[PDB]
Design a protein around this ligand. Structure first.
Ligand code: NA
Ligand code: NA
Lengths: 100, 277, 9
């Protein structure tokens, strides 16, 4: 029983542009066991409708999941992904760096 | 490569106090998922996940579902057996994983078949490449090996991996030919990230490519900067394609000694990219 | 297509 902390990336489906519709992504990977709590945040608040891909795993048996929701970025709105897992003392917050 | 693979990924996990163990199965051709099954669905069934599979008839979806329901119950029995083999309490949660499938060449001929299993994220038992023997990782897996030798499982794996696997993989490749057999090349560019007065970051981006296999390397004066290049894990865009970037820290002014090189099946010839300010 | 269900572990 060795547990593996998730790696987290936050990014958009296409290059971002204030005012046009896109997709916000939180890809969590590398983790074990498979139970994970993944929230996408808009200015700190949990976004309501967030889909996710079907649970699968890599060659090394670690799990991965893509979480995503439609959004339209602004210059104002800050976005983040908050991840909890058994390995994590408290939820990790990863902000969307839009400057890439 | 023009060679292809089909893989199924099985996960079964115990959750004492919260019902019976959950069973999930997903099927892939190369980097495209095409089916799922979740025993936690209100109506459990094998369900399409790609458009080229929806055309299969009911006898297809009925067989795929009945097998996955049986497996729901069989993998619960395996999870009870494995708890025994490791003298483990009935209170902890544990995970069994299996992945199996076949690789075919650009002529549809079997390259090799696979069946491996993991318990709690640890290699447990693997069908050897000969498709007739097993490799047990510990004395618990040896017990599983004796059952499988008696049940004559390796022979059934060989008949599945040589027969049904490659024939149905071949059929999917034909039904999904416009996507599965289409390599989409990466869209690339190099960005420049000032760090201080004396160094900066060059980041080389690859977007929208398929399949996910790709090479991104920085060279300084034609020599690879592998130890000094930061790589992100290839990540899915959501739309079947993938993304990746490679980054290197460079002395400001020396930016032209550095080249980013990109290899992918979609590109006619490899790419060499520089920062152009 | 999936493999026939086999023997438990
Ligand atoms: Na967890
Ligand atoms: Na040079």
């Amino acid at each position: 029983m060795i547990q593996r902390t998730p790696k987290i990336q936050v990014y958009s489906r296409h290059p971002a542009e204030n005012g046009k519709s896109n997709f916000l992504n939180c890809y969590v990977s590398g983790f074990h066991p498979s139970d994970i709590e993944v929230d996408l945040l808009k200015n700190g608040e949990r976004i309501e409708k967030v889909e996710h891909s079907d649970l699968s795993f890599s060659k090394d048996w670690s799990f991965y999941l893509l979480y995503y929701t439609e959004f339209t970025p602004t210059e104002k709105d800050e976005y983040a992904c908050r991840v909890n897992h058994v390995t994590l003392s408290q939820p990790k917050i990863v902000k969307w760096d839009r400057d890439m | 490569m023009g060679s292809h693979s089909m893989r199924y990924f099985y996960t079964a996990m115990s959750r004492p106090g919260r019902g019976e163990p959950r069973f999930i199965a997903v099927g892939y051709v190369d980097d495209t998922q095409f089916v799922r099954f979740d025993s936690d669905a209100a109506s459990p069934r094998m369900a399409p996940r790609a458009p080229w599979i929806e055309q299969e008839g009911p006898e297809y979806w009925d067989r795929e579902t009945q097998i996955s329901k049986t497996n729901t119950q069989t993998y619960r029995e395996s999870l009870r057996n494995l708890r025994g083999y490791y003298n483990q309490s009935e209170a902890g949660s544990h995970t069994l994983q299996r992945m199996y499938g076949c690789d075919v060449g650009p002529d549809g001929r079997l390259l090799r078949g696979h069946d491996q299993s993991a318990y709690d994220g640890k290699d447990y038992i693997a069908l050897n490449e000969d498709l007739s023997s097993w490799t047990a990782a510990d004395t618990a897996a040896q017990i599983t090996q004796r059952k499988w030798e008696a049940a004559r499982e390796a022979e059934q794996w060989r008949a599945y991996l040589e027969g049904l696997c490659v024939e149905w993989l071949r059929r999917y490749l034909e039904n999904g030919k416009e996507t599965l057999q289409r390599a989409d090349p990466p869209k690339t560019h190099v960005t420049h990230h000032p760090i201080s007065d004396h160094e900066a970051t060059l980041r080389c981006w690859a977007l929208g490519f398929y399949p996910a296999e790709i090479t991104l390397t920085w060279q300084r004066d034609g020599e690879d900067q592998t130890q000094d290049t930061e790589l992100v894990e290839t990540r899915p865009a959501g739309d079947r394609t993938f993304q990746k970037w490679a980054a290197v820290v460079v002395p400001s002014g020396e930016e032209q000694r550095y080249t980013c090189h990109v290899q992918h099946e979609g590109l006619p010839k490899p790419l060499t990219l520089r920062w152009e300010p | 297509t999936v493999a026939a269900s086999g023997h438990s572990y």
